[PDB]
Every structure is written in C-alpha cells, then in structure tokens.
C-alpha cells in the first residue's frame, strides 16, 4: 500500500507492469488463487536503483493472509532471488492459498537488492472461513505429509521451555541459597568464602556434568528421529527467459518505436502532454489505446471502448488521444498526447516536481484494426508547469 | 628518523632487484627478469591477478612513483613511530596488580 | 590434489574440462613436454564465485617439479590475468619443462579472482635426471643469455651478508663497551650519562656517515651494471577469443541442444539419473557417447568401444545409455541417462547432498555415424534418493 | 595541459580523439564557439581506469575563460554523468561562450570516474573585451531573465554579512563587558557567578528570541520571493547513441581490420615502428594516411599531400608509409609501419619505456582513390630498443 509514498519517477522508470491479473476475487480458506501479470525493466535504469541483476518475485500482501505455494518469472519456479536484464520483459505467477478471513489488498511486487521495493497493481481479495481450519500440507522426500501450519512447532516448544525451566531454577536456587543482600555484605566483609566454598563447586560440577548429558543425549535421539538432512538451499538463480511473444519491445520484425520529444505536467495538478515520435514498423495501421506507468492505465476511450476487468484504484479513461488517424504502416508520425485523470494527482505522480530528476517512464500501447497490440517504451524528461 | 627510514628503503634495496629489472621479450611481450622467475617457478595460489603492485593510474605525473612512495612511507612512519613507541613504554610495564 | 575437498556443485557448475592432454608422461631434467586443453565456462555461474573476468591459468603442481615455460589461453600468450566469458569455451596449453626427479601429479587449473582455485585433470609425470643438471635459459633484450635458475642470486647475497654483519658488529660493540645490567644499573642510579656521552656519538655519527656513504656507492655501482630498467610489468591482459570450431557450445549453424528435466542421485552411492530433452539441430543422426563433470568422464561404450588414453582415476566406462536410438535429425527426444560409477563416489560427487544448492553441471557429447562430436551443455537441479 | 605528465600508454589505450574542431580561434567576449569532435573508446580498456560506464565531458580550460553553454555527446544534452561503452565511437560538441580577455588554450576532456581525467585535443583560442561586459543571459520557466554572471549574489551578502556583523558584535559584547584576564581570574578564584548571572541570562534569552524570530521571518519572506523551487537535478544519463555512419570502427558490411604483430620503439628516441596485418574488407584499394595516439596526428603525406588544419604541436607529417601500394579489395597484407616526429618524444610518449604495460593503442586511417575514410583499431604489445 505503501507505493504513494515512493518517489514519483523512480516508479515510472524501472519496473512497467501489465497484463495483471488475479485468478479470483473471493476465496475460502484453503482455496487456491493466482496472481500472474508480466514486466517491463525499463531500459534507463535510474542510478538511484541498484541493478536488477539481483532480484525477488513477491506477494505484495499485509503477513501471510493467503500463504505463498509457488512462484515463477522468466519461466522459471522462482522461490530464491532471480536476475532480470535491462530492457526485456518477463512473465510472473504467484500460487496464493486463503488463510485469514477478512478484505486484504494484494499486489505483485519485486524487490531490487540495491534498491529495495518496486510495488505493482494491487486487487482486494476477500477470504472466507476460519483461520483454524487452514493447513497446508507438504510431502517430504520420504514420501510422508506435515502440515506447514503446525509441523515441528510441538518439538520446539518441547526444547525451549524445559531449559528455560531449568535456567529459572538455576536462578532461584542461588537466589535461596545466598541472599542478595547477603551476599554483597559477605563479599564486602572479607568473606567471600563464606558464599562459595565446594560444596557449591560440587553442585556446579553435578548441573553442568548433567547439562552436557542433557545435551548429548538430546542431540543423538533427533539424529535418529530425522537421519536424513540437507542444508539451507541458497544463491541466485540461472539467467531467466524473456517474453518473445510477439510483440512486445524491440521483439520480432514488426514493432513500433516511440520517443518522447518534450512534455509538461501540471502543479498542482491531474494533466501531462506529451510529444511522441512514433514510428511504425509494422504492416499495420496502428491507433495508441494505452499508456502505463506506475501499475496505472491510461485509457483512449477510442480504443477501449469496453473496458477492461482491472482495480478501480488503477484504472483511466482518458489515456486521450490521437486523432484516430493510425499512422502507418511505416509511417513516422509525431502526435501529441495529452493524460487526464484524477488518479494521476492521487497516486501521487504529481509529486514529481518534488524529485531529484524530473523525469517520466512507462509503456505505450498502440492496436490494430483487430485485436493485435504492439507494445513501446516511453520515456524522458518532462517540464512543469506552475499553475495558480 | 623515521623520515630517512622511509626515504632509504628503496635505495637500500636497489642493488639487491636491479638485477631482475632487466627486461626481456617472451612470446612478443616485454617482461622484467622478475615477472618471468615468478612465472616459471610455479607457486599452486599465486595468480598473477593477486598481486598488489603498481598497475598505472591516470594520476602519475612522471617518472614520480618511487620518490613519491618514498616519501609517502617516510611520513606515514613518523606517526607509526610514535604510536609504537609509546607501546614499546607501555610493554615495558612493571606494574604490579593484585587478582585476576 | 585437493579438488576431490571441494564443494561438489561447484565443481560441476563452473569450468568444463575436455580434450586434457599432456605431451609425454616422462621426461628428463631439461626436456619440455605440453599441458593442453580445452574449457567451457559454464553458462548459470554460481553466485558463491565471482565472475571469472578475471582469472589466471596455472599449473596445478607440487611447487616447481616442472619449470612453466610459457602458457596460452584464448589464443593468447597469458603471463597475466585474462577475462574469460561465460558461456564460451578456451582452449588453453601450457608448456612444462623438467625440473625435479620423481613422479608428480600435474594438473590444469584456472583461479578466479573472486572465488579460488578451480582444478582441471591431473596425470602423473615421472621426471628423470639430477636437479643438478637443470637450467633455464632465458635471453635478455641486450642479447645476452643467463640462467634463471641461479642468475642475480650471488649479487643478493653480495648485499644482503654484509649488511647482516654490519647489523650484528653494531649490536655487539655497544653490548660490549656498555653492559646490558651496567648500563640498567647506571641509568637507574642516575647517570645515564655515563652510559652515553659523546665520543660515543663521535662512533655513531661516523657509522651514520659510512653507512650512507656505503648506500650511495651500492646504489651508483648497480646503476652502472643495469643501466637500463624496467617496472614489472602487470595487469589484465585484452580480451581473449573464444574457440570457434565447429562445435562446440552455441557455435555454428548446426548443434544439439539438452534441457535437464528432472534428476535423481542416490545417497550414499555411485549413481545419478537423468532426463533429458535434446533436440538436433545438426543434418546427422546422433548417439550420446560421453557426459564430462569435474574433469570426470562418463563413457558410452556403445560409442566408445574404444576406448581413450585419460587418466585413471577419472575415466569411467558406464556413461551409458541411449538406446543407441540415433535421434534425429531435426528430432527432439527425451531420454534417460543413467550414470554409475564408483568415480562418482571417489571423487566425492556424491557429497552434493551436503552442498548448499543440488544441483548438477556438464558438457554432454554426442557423436554422428563418423567422427563429428557435437557438444551441449546439461545443468539444473537435482534430487537425492536416500537409501539404505 | 597536463597531459604530457600522465603516463603513455593510458593516454593511448582509452579514449581516441578524432576530428576534433573549434568553431573558431579569436572571440569576444559575449561571442559564441564551439569545440567538438569524435571519440573511440578503446577495446582493450586498462585495469587501471574504471570501466567508462559513469563519465562526464568538459571543456578541459583553465577556470572559466569560456562559460559552456551547453554540451552533447552520444547524440544527448549532457550536463550530467553518461555512459560510454567499451568499442564504440561517439562525437561531441560544447558550445563555449567568451569570458576573460587572453590567449588560453582550450581542450576536449572526458572524466571517468574510476580512472579520472582523459584530456583531448586543445587549441589557442584567443578572447577579445573586458570581462566587465560579459553578460549569460538565462531564462527562468516563469519567463523572466536573469544574468547568471551576477544573479543571487546580492541576496547572498545581504543574509551573511549581518550575521557575521551579528556573530561579531556578540563575542565583543562579551569581551568588554567581563574581561579574559578578570573573568579567568574571577572564575580561578571561585567566582564564577560573578562573571555570569541572570541578568546576563536575560540578554542571552532575548538575543536567542531575536535570532529565532528573525530566522522565521527571513525563511518565511525568502519563501514568498521564490515560492516555486526545485531540488538539484542529478543523476547518471540514459544510455547514448553511437556514432554509426558510416565506417567508423567494426560498423557497416565495408571495414578495414588491423592487428598489431610486433613492434619496436626507441628509447631514447623519435620512433616507433609497427607490423600491421591489414584486412580490408572494403571493396576498395586503400591507402593508410593516418595513426592518432593521445590526439597526436601521424600523416602519411603521399595521402594528405595538404595537409589539415590542427594545433601545432599535435601535427606530424611522418606517419609513414606504406608503399602506396593500395592492398585489396579482398587483400589480406602485413604491412611495416615507421612513427617518427619530435612529437612523439615532446609528448612524453616515449615514456612509455617508464610505464608498467609497454603497450601501443589507437586509431589506423585508411582511405580509397576518392574520399572515403576506413578507421581500424591498433594496439597491443611493442618492445623497447635502447640506444646510446
Ligand atoms: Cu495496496
Ligand atoms: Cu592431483
Ligand atoms: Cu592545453
């Protein structure tokens, strides 16, 4: 949720998220869901962020209300930390199960090792049921079934608690046996011995002879229970594959290239116009029906005229417009672009003029005559505009 | 003191590596006699990589790398000197304490 | 020697040892002989070790036993550091000449500058001769020849015994004319100054005086012998050219190509299985005849009937099997690959159950009707058996 | 200017200067100019200098004789850090502005931030006026313009010298109103409350009251003026555009390829000379006509019969030869080369023999019958001839 707070441009310059989606809406505890969406790693990685050569798929989610089952980008099953390159983009799914009833905002999220949170779309998700009716389970290589939820909790306890006995009365013991106060005036006399003499010494080298048995013992019976363990599996994982689907920036013989060309944003504001230098590339006559930013859709009503299934939060309906007039087929066109929307100030994009580089990032989606959508990257600086 | 310390500890040491500061060609590179004694004798966790030696910077101004080195070592030995000095005092303690 | 001590993944996951070849097995004091190779710079390196863009080719040997001569690595004569590119493959040799009577180990090596010492195959040299008998030479740029062996070592010792004495002299005259308990007992009565006052500074300004005297002539005198001089001479060497023949990984128009999926290795044991998806890719029919791991070679005897000159301790006959089910061409088949071995065993690959991430790495060799060998690269995770 | 001090072989194997021109060589003050040029980012980059992936262009000047007015490189504005990549080329060009009357001599300069300053070609630029004229002038995004030769200066004065007027009446406050020597002299004697009671206590309570207020007030006011401010702008820049017309090193289907295969240079001396293995690669015969080091201009004279306009003490005319003899198209020649100018010497290149990589680096220019200009890479290793 934290995502308002963060830097403006930063957001809009490294991670460009779409196609998200979320399997279900509403889920019973145990009832499996699935967030999956894709990624655009923007091409001018700001200095401010590490890069991405080190990086972790995650659930954007307030503790574990719905428990994570698996995971995978790049088209790998990814529960350890993956490398995403410059510029390409990447396929993401996360297997969620219900755990805690209640109306949990849930976001696709990455984290950069230099850098830390990119947070992406969100989507409530109500959960049903009773926590106490939540399990997992798990096989082991044995071929047995636990139960994540409650699985080696009762030998824990049966460990700890016992030696934190033992240590209180440890306590307690010499607190009896001596005063405090006794003691300090005894030591503070001159005797001193008068608090420890053997057979305290004999005590001592009884409790520890019987500690390091204790110890002993207990480390040979779960060496049998349990004769078969591995380490902690850690490290970064093998170069990840990119979507090549079809397309999708600087992929395939056909695609359209944008380049800003100036731009101004209002403050305080709702309003950014942009100049686009597009050129197109494909056999097709493109019109623009989209442009993302943070997770945030801009819509040309033109082309969407319905209307997708995407967070309220989220979602604009003047991403507006070209003149309809769809460029080419290799045509090179410079249009301007004007974003509307209420959202734009709400997300706090119009904080960019707070920023250390003022600086706009994100994804254009340009259609044909049919379904097909060509995918390019925006972006540059934008100027402001001190309004009253 | 400690300034000469310094400033004669490559003169001193001259003589006994001008020797293998002579160069030669193998395999259309130039090496010192050094670098090749070092290369033929092999040592099992020595790389080349390891070193720690000077490799050029865009900062020499000369022609200046060993009187400046010289210099350098002669200062930075005036404060060792004192600091170690001081312990050499402090080693030679006769204090007498009482437990342990 | 160490390797079979290494992390067994690591081992796998790293360099690609194939083609190890030395010259002779025998040789005289004085007489040359050749280590060379190939290797292949595994394509998902493991995080634990860094980037082997910098690296330095070595020869895995007990102290000079052989006098290295000169060494090359992507066909480059490599007294330095070189950069060596994942993914790619080096061909590398070594020239070795004869220095110390009796039977040595010698191994390939490569050390990363990030991460250690990486051990190709080793064979056993038996040398013959007296150490007595050794030489270099080496010839200077002046024209001169010398021998390293002994060259400049009596001029080191010119200095350094002098010097040494002249010390000692020091030392014993002031212990001499004052005591070590005489001058305590003077300097702790009073005085001090009975220990020291000048002429005894006369010696020492004197010896002060001779003592530069002696370094401006020492030095002048070595600048004469030696007039011309040159720094040692360090750094990374340009970057290297990888081998292009013929193929050989991700090289030419025609290749197979191999996708782990799904593995198991029994624990304790000699065995690993498992599946993998080739495609061919090549315009020939295609038998798997060898899998390289740590230097390890796991033969089909199928394909190697006979049967080749390697290294014992390494050279395993049941790499096996195909079904001799040539494969293609353009077909893509998943097949299951045994591997057992007591090597697996020896040279402790079976100890990747105490490594952090199981994980297995290689070249696979396929191999046409004729001669032509078409290399792949195998890797990914996998599973223990835990038996009995 | 310094650049005769670094060391050889860095100023040639890092950043190679071509093409480099100053609009003009006279100017008033007021009066416009450009320097500009292109540049090779060497191959084979030295250990010793960071990776050139953060630098910065500069008008290599001494102070500002010459306000910039703004600059590119790689087809970008570049007022902050850029990124140049390892073998390819980029031009440049800085618009410089005349500010102090003289003849100051004014370079190309590329910083990198590992490595630290590359200085470029320079040039006497004379500067005509009085600095009392000189004006920028700027304009603000409200619209208004300020002169940035005197803007702010006024406001600054205006809030530190009354504080440092206020500091300074303080401390003489103090100082006559109790003594040093009858306040030290109080306080050694025991009192102490002599020298401060409350009423001086008062006057620090409403001294501290004023300044507190007029702090409130000052921020406050300078917050009406100027109620619309940005933070600095900072940061490294999206990756450049390389120089791609039109053959320019490793670009296009027609190139010349140069390796370096030996090489010889005088020590002391003037000379240096080379066997090249040509390729070309071209369908055109091709004459070599030049050899750029560190700016240093090494012409074949059978090629620039006349002979270029560029600074003096940069200009040799024996970069000579081949045998005029024009290789391909096809043609695969090794070719002897023979560098000889006062310059190399003048330029401290023959220093070389001082540095700790004897090795060559820069750009071979070859041309057809016609115009057309063919640029390859040369460097590697060269030997030391030492002479009487
Ligand atoms: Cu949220
Ligand atoms: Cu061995
Ligand atoms: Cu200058």
């Given at each position: 949720h934290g995502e308002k707070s963060q830097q403006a441009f930063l957001r809009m310059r490294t991670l460009n998220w779409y196609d998200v989606q979320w399997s279900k809406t509403t889920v019973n505890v145990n009832?499996?869901?699935?967030?999956?969406?894709?990624?655009?790693?923007?091409?001018?990685?700001?200095?401010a962020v590490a890069n991405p050569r080190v990086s972790f798929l995650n659930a954007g989610e307030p503790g574990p209300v719905l428990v994570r089952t698996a995971q995978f980008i790049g088209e790998q099953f990814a529960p350890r930390s993956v490398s995403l390159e410059i510029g390409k983009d990447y396929a993401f799914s996360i297997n969620l199960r219900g755990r805690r009833a209640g109306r949990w905002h849930v976001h696709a999220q990455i984290n950069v090792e230099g850098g830390g949170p990119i947070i992406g779309p969100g989507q409530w998700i109500e959960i049903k049921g009773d926590m106490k009716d939540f399990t997992d389970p798990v096989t082991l290589l044995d071929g047995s079934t636990v139960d994540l939820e409650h699985y080696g909790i009762?030998?824990?306890?049966?460990?700890?608690?016992?030696?934190?006995?033992?240590?209180?009365?440890?306590?307690?013991?010499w607190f009896v046996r001596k005063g405090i106060i006794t003691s300090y005036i005894r030591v503070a006399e001159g005797k001193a011995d008068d608090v420890i003499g053997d057979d305290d010494r004999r005590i001592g080298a009884i409790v520890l002879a019987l500690t390091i048995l204790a110890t002993i013992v207990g480390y040979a019976v779960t060496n049998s229970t349990f004769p078969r363990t591995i380490p902690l599996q850690?490290?970064?994982?093998?170069?990840?594959?990119?979507?090549?689907?079809?397309?999708?920036?600087?992929?395939?013989?056909?695609?359209?290239?944008?380049?800003?060309?100036?731009?101004?944003?209002?403050?305080?504001?709702?309003?950014?116009?942009?100049?686009?230098?597009?050129?197109?590339?494909?056999?097709?006559?493109?019109?623009?029906?989209?442009?993302?930013?943070?997770?945030?859709?801009?819509?040309?009503?033109?082309?969407?005229?319905?209307?997708?299934?995407?967070?309220?939060?989220?979602?604009?309906?003047?991403?507006?417009?070209?003149?309809?007039?769809?460029?080419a087929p290799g045509e090179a066109?410079?249009?301007?672009?004007?974003?509307?929307?209420?959202?734009?100030?709400?997300?706090?994009?119009?904080?960019?003029?707070?920023?250390?580089?003022?600086?706009?990032?994100?994804?254009?989606?340009?259609?044909?005559?049919?379904?097909?959508?060509?995918?390019?990257?925006?972006?540059?600086?934008?100027?402001?505009?001190?309004?009253? | 003191g400690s300034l000469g310390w310094g400033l004669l500890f490559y003169p001193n040491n001259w003589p006994a590596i001008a020797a293998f500061h002579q160069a030669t060609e193998q395999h259309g590179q130039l090496m010192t006699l050094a670098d090749l004694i070092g290369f033929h004798f092999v040592?099992?966790?020595m790389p080349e990589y390891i070193r720690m030696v000077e490799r050029g910077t865009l900062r020499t101004f000369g022609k200046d790398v060993v009187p400046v080195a010289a210099f350098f070592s002669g200062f930075v030995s005036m404060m060792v000197y004192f600091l170690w000095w001081f312990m050499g005092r402090?080693?030679?303690?006769?204090?007498?304490?009482?437990?342990?």
């Open positions: 009832e499996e869901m699935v967030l999956s969406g894709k990624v655009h790693v923007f091409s001018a990685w700001p200095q009762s030998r824990v306890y049966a460990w700890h608690l016992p030696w934190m006995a033992v240590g209180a009365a440890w306590i307690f013991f850690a490290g970064l994982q093998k170069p990840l594959t990119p979507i090549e689907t079809e397309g999708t920036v600087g992929v395939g013989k056909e695609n359209v290239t944008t380049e800003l060309n100036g731009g101004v944003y209002k403050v305080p504001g709702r309003e950014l116009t942009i100049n686009v230098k597009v050129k197109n590339n494909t056999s097709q006559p493109l019109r623009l029906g989209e442009y993302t930013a943070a997770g945030l859709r801009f819509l040309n009503p033109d082309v969407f005229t319905t209307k997708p299934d995407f967070p309220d939060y989220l979602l604009a309906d003047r991403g507006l417009s070209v003149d309809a007039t769809p460029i066109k410079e249009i301007v672009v004007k974003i509307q929307d209420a959202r734009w100030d709400i997300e706090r994009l119009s904080d960019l003029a707070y920023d250390t580089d003022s600086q706009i990032g994100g994804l254009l989606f340009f259609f044909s005559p049919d379904g097909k959508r060509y995918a390019s990257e925006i972006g540059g600086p934008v100027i402001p505009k001190f309004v009253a | 040592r099992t966790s402090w080693y030679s303690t006769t204090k007498v304490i009482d437990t342990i």
